[PDB]
Amino acid sequence: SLQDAEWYWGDISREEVNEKLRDTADGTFLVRDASTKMHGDYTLTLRKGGNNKLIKIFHRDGKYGFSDPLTFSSVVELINHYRNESLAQYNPKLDVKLLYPVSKYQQDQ
């Protein structure tokens, strides 16, 4: 599940991930490795019309979380519930959902 998850592609660089996100609509999302371990653990990236929004996933004692909300067993399920509704609970400015799941492998194509 974890290495796959469709939206997560193992070790990835920010530049390549923004190139993958390019020209997609709002609500689009995908997860990327954090540049350094001292910086964080993983980066959720959103899309909000041309503007790319970067959210940190921090890993604690088996707990994955953006900030105060940390009670999540894995990064996969955290991202899952976070997609269901909007991330306005965590950050009011994030008043959009992870609805658009444009990150599926182009095997179908």
Q: How many CB atoms lie within 10 A of CB 19?
A: 9
Pairwise CA distance, residues 97 & 39, whole Å: 25
Resolution (A): 4.6
Pairwise CA distance, residues 70 & 65, whole Å: 4
Pairwise CA distance, residues 41 & 25, whole Å: 26
Pairwise CA distance, residues 54 & 66, whole Å: 11
Q: Which method was it determined by? A: cryo-EM
Pairwise CA distance, residues 27 & 55, whole Å: 14
Task: Please name the residue that has the structure tokens 């990236």.
Answer: 45
Tokens of 79: 């991202």
